Amino acid sequence: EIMKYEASILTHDSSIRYLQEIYNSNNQKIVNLKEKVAQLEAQCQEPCKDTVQIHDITGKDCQDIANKGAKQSGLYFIKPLKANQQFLVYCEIDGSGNGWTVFQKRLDGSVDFKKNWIQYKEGFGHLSPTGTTEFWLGNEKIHLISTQSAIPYALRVELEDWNGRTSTADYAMFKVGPEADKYRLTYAYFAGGDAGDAFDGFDFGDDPSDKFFTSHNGMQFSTWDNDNDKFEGNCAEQDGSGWWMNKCHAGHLNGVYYQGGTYSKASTPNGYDNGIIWATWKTRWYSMKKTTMKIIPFNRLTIGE
Amino acid sequence: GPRP
Amino acid sequence: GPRP
Amino acid sequence: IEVLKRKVIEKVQHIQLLQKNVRAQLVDMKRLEVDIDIKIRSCRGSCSRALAREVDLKDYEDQQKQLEQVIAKD
Amino acid sequence: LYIDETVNSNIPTNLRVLRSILENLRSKIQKLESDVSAQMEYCRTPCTVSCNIPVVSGKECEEIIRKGGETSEMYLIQPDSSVKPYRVYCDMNTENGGWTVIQNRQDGSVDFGRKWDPYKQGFGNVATNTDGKNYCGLPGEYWLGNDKISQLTRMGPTELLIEMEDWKGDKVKAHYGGFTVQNEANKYQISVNKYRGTAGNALMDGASQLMGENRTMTIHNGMFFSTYDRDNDGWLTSDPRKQCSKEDGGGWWYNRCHAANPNGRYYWGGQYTWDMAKHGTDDGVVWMNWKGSWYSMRKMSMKIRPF
């Protein structure tokens, strides 16, 4: 009769029809959403970009390399005339054409210079591409790069403070004794620089000898745990540090990196000086803010060319 | 510095 | 996991 | 004046088709969602900032369950 | 007869979901279609770092812990100086230190599913800036190149240390006093031994919770490292779509196929199931002998040493 109206509930002939497309679309859709990944992952393949990077040119010391090209004061693998595993140094090239090299540095307080002999030897702390970064290339290293056929090097104590000014203290015929004779330095003379020369002793008045001892020239290296100084024991350890000791010092670049500098009779662990002092510039309480000690082949103090 |  |  | 339930069946069957097809869709995504989820991650060590999201499988592995009931009609 | 109601009732529970879920899934084909645009975007700009390379170096991490290297971070080890000083990550806190990392799992970040070269040279971030220091004291996922490895093992007595840590704190450690990754000329054969371990010997002792013929084809020892462009599996089949590496996601000493799968596909939360994987297979950072084919982990590393 009219029941043949079921041809009405024959709507699904589209209640399913249309909807169906909303299926055949997705599949086809995903064909597209494939490459929309095939490509994304083809990007997520490389690692993060790193700042620090090793230049290729190498050779004897920073100078040698940076005389075979070079100009960017950064990081190169050197390998002393006589040595083995070419280590990594933080050169500091100039305009004239000379390439210094560093064995120290100080700015933040980070690399804590209160390490041990084996550490002060093979060198410790972390370098950097720029330079900003406390570090101690380490006595050992400092050797093979100062006694390589021994063409007279030099030290260039640089400075600054919590007030502006900086300085410079020079020394010729630079060298550091092989671990044998210990890590005792061996230079000839102070050579200018308003920096001052506290490596030649400084009388603090406490006693005439307040200067015979406090000399750093010729004084072997006294880590906190292995002193070769001239004290009733290990000076270093006393004020804590690893620095060419005597009974004790006058000029500390490996010591207590004090904030705002100038310390007192309070931060004195055992009681005496340890801060970043240097009597031929500042007293025994003013702790320097910055500090660095680079070398370079002697015939450069009046290079001319 | 100096000591005792 | 191994293979059948 | 034969009625015609034939066309009917042929339609209700024309459904059974998109039940095989669906189960595929439903799962094609249960694994595509995760090819990305895993590849979105594989960027952190190449690309700058990353996206931190979720997935909720109790959705898929649920929006599946109710579908496995939708069966039997003859 | 009366079956004519499925036209007004049985159907009314059909197109009411074939529309529904095909929609409430249509909204997936949405999100999971922009978030790809929204990370593909924040991908336009690469990530960067600054691992100010520290002073202390050495032949390998051992000599470097024997040189004052007491903090764990990015070092520069230089094996036989007849090669290049490649950055590496040392472990010097757990187990007498001197542990030179080779692979590391701790999160997504790095797609371990690569090929020949990449697996040979290396890929990933060897370390990331410790967020507050100069260097890089926190490790990032990577695969310190194969070649680099096959060489380190070649330094006489090389003993690898394989660790993992499952999502619920718990953790176990494997170990093969004797470990050697032949050189690429050998398809990089893996010779391991002196196994000791509380995580199950899944590399040589095959997969435990199984049986003979099924098991032994889950032995990595004596296997030829494979990748989806180098079929050195154990799975003999003319069918190229089916290979232990093209599936299981990544490069590994594959022997029809695996009792352990570091370098798999990174699975979040650990638990996962075939109805999730690109190839149904149990692909992913799985160590079967401790967690079974359906449990990927949080961290899966591998640190070696000499002696």
Ligand SMILES: *[C@@H]1O[C@H](CO)[C@@H](O)[C@H](O)[C@H]1NC(C)=O
């Ligand atoms: C071998 O593996 C197959 C995989 O389907 C399984 O059915 C069978 O029970 C296994 N037998 C053994 C020896 O474990």
Ligand SMILES: [Ca+2]
């Ligand atoms: Ca003494």
Ligand SMILES: [Ca+2]
């Ligand atoms: Ca094969």
